[PDB]
Amino acid sequence: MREIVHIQAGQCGNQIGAKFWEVISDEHGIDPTGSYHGDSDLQLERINVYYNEATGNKYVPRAILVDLEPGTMDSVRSGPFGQIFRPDNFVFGQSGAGNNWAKGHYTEGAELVDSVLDVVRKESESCDCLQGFQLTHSLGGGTGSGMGTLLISKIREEYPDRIMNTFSVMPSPKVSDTVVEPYNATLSVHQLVENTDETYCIDNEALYDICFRTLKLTTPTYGDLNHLVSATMSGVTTCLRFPGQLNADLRKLAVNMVPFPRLHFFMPGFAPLTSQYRALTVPELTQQMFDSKNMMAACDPRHGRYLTVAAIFRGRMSMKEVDEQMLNVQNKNSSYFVEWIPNNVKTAVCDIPPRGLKMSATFIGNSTAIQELFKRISEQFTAMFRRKAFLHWYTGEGMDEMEFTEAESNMNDLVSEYQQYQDA
Amino acid sequence: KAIEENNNFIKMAKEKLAQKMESNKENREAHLAAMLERLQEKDKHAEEVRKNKELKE
Numbered sequence: 132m133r134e135i136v137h138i139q140a141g142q143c144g145n146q147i148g149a150k151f152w153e154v155i156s157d158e159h160g161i162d163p164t165g166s167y168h169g170d171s172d173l174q175l176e177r178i179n180v181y182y183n184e185a186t187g188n189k190y191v192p193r194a195i196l197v198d199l200e201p202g203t204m205d206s207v208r209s210g211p212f213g214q215i216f217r218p219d220n221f222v223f224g225q226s227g228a229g230n231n232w233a234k235g236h237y238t239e240g241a242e243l244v245d246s247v248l249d250v251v252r253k254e255s256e257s258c259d260c261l262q263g264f265q266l267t268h269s270l271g272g273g274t275g276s277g278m279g280t281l282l283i284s285k286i287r288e289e290y291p292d293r294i295m296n297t298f299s300v301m302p303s304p305k306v307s308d309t310v311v312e313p314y315n316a317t318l319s320v321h322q323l324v325e326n327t328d329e330t331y332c333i334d335n336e337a338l339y340d341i342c343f344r345t346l347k348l349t350t351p352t353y354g355d356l357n358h359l360v361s362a363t364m365s366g367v368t369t370c371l372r373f374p375g376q377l378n379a380d381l382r383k384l385a386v387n388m389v390p391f392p393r394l395h396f397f398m399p400g401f402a403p404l405t406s407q408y409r410a411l412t413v414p415e416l417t418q419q420m421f422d423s424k425n426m427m428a429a430c431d432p433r434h435g436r437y438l439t440v441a442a443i444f445r446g447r448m449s450m451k452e453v454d455e456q457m458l459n460v461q462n463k464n465s466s467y468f469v470e471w472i473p474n475n476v477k478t479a480v481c482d483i484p485p486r487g488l489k490m491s492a493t494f495i496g497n498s499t500a501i502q503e504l505f506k507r508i509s510e511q512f513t514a515m516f517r518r519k520a521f522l523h524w525y526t527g528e529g530m531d532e533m534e535f536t537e538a539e540s541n542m543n544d545l546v547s548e549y550q551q552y553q554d555a
Numbered sequence: 556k557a558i559e560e561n562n563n564f565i566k567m568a569k570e571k572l573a574q575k576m577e578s579n580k581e582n583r584e585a586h587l588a589a590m591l592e593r594l595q596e597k598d599k600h601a602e603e604v605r606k607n608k609e610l611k612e
């Protein structure tokens with residue numbers, strides 16, 4: 132188990148996805164045309180996880196770029212690292228999906244899905260040992276939401292034993308393109324509860340607040356939100372992309388993070404938050420990454436309890452001080468970690484720091500406080516659905532009101548299930 | 556179901572339209588048929604007037 136297949140779907144999926152390849156290619160010393168110009172052998176030791184090797188010693192990302200319109204995928208190709216991607220892996224339709232889950236999942240996206248799966252099969256075939264898939268998308272649009280979850284369902288049919296993880300951007304009125312986002316997200320969440328092993332719940336509410344409150348940016352663009360996303364995505368993928376004596380693949384990580392199959396929605400976090408000169412001390416990283424302000428999903432961890440925690444520190448620091456600090460927050464806030472999973476906070480350290488920072492920490496939290504996120508989308512859903520508002524857009528594409536009722540019920544069951552373990 | 560309903564709408568729009576355009580052509584023709592039949596009734600009255608002049612001499 133070494134190779135991971137990456138897929139990016141829709142405007143948002145391709146935007147944050149393109150930043151992921153901008154960040155990690157710099158970390159692996161791969162230039163905009165695909166040639167290696169690093170210095171450490173550690174940059175090439177596990178380069179196979181995300182790159183295929185081409186003729187002339189070129190490194191081509193194992194990345195499939197999906198959208199139902201050309202727009203954003205034309206921007207990706209024109210953008211700074213656009214030339215590195217394999218041209219066959221740009222699979223796109225023309226009419227778009229108009230922020231419509233039904234168009235992505237059932238009509239427009241159905242017409243395109245089989246040609247995307249052919250490229251996935253192409254990449255999966257020439258993989259010595261495929262460990263799984265990762266997907267970037269939003270749940271608020273049409274393509275990433277509707278087609279992304281369709282692809283996830285088709286990939287599970289063809290590759291039932293491989294890991295499926297997602298980086299799933301959640302919608303919020305604060306950063307809102309259309310009023311139907313709660314509908315699109317609720318329909319997607321039900322798909323993710325069934326068909327993913329992990330979903331990283333990037334909340335655009337939280338990314339905005341981090342940009343506004345704790346980074347003093349008055350008018351945040353999507354680039355400012357995506358900067359925080361790409362830093363986190365680098366962090367969660369670090370332990371696969373480098374050593375250091377950590378013998379773990381996606382399954383091993385998923386086995387230790389997910390005690391219950393449906394409860395695999397994580398709370399990502401990063402320290403320090405950037406947009407510096409004084410490098411942070413190990414106590415500061417530990418306090419910041421556990422701080423609510425640094426959470427990428429707009430939930431208060433004090434309102435829930437941690438099932439599992441994973442923290443991966445980057446940079447040259449004392450592992451003794453890391454162990455001391457990670458044991459300090461557990462033993463001084465022991466009510467917020469479930470007693471019925473002993474030793475649930477685990478830690479790794481990687482020597483290579485990311486670009487610009489001398490040391491950093493990435494936080495992955497399977498907290499029951501994530502119910503707050505699903506409750507917030509459930510309220511926005513019901514507000515519209517009690518009056519069947521905007522439903523004509525979905526019923527015109529052949530959907531039934533029953534499918535909405537089901538999805539509503541399934542997400543409120545997920546919230547009930549998170550509540551069960553919060554009190555136990 | 557999405558095809559079925561899009562076809563249903565094309566179907567029933569086409570039938571509703573053909574039913575109206577035919578019903579209108581029936582009406583407008585029956586309106587003009589009545590107008591000419593009243594005008595032809597005057598020609599028959601003017602033939603009785605011109606006969607009652609000659610049949611009174």
Ligand SMILES: Nc1nc2c(ncn2[C@@H]2O[C@H](COP(=O)(O)OP(=O)(O)O)[C@@H](O)[C@H]2O)c(=O)[nH]1
Nearest residue numbers: 141142143146269271272273274275302306353
């Ligand atoms: N964080 C982030 N969110 C985005 C971005 N672009 C769109 N969104 C969010 O995604 C939703 C719209 O989906 P989008 O990806 O544009 O539609 P799609 O192309 O049909 O998948 C909204 O909730 C937006 O707030 C982006 O670049 N970054």
Ligand SMILES: CC(C)(C)c1[nH]cnc1/C=c1\[nH]c(=O)/c(=C/c2ccccc2)[nH]c1=O
Nearest residue numbers: 296367368370384385441442443477478479
């Ligand atoms: C011991 C340590 C810190 C390595 C650990 N223990 C359990 N989890 C992790 C970390 C991770 N756990 C994950 O599940 C994880 C998920 C992942 C990795 C790559 C791509 C997508 C998801 N990434 C991680 O870094």
Ligand SMILES: [Ca+2]
Nearest residue numbers: 226238239242
């Ligand atoms: Ca078509």
Ligand SMILES: [Mg+2]
Nearest residue numbers: 142143272308
């Ligand atoms: Mg959009």
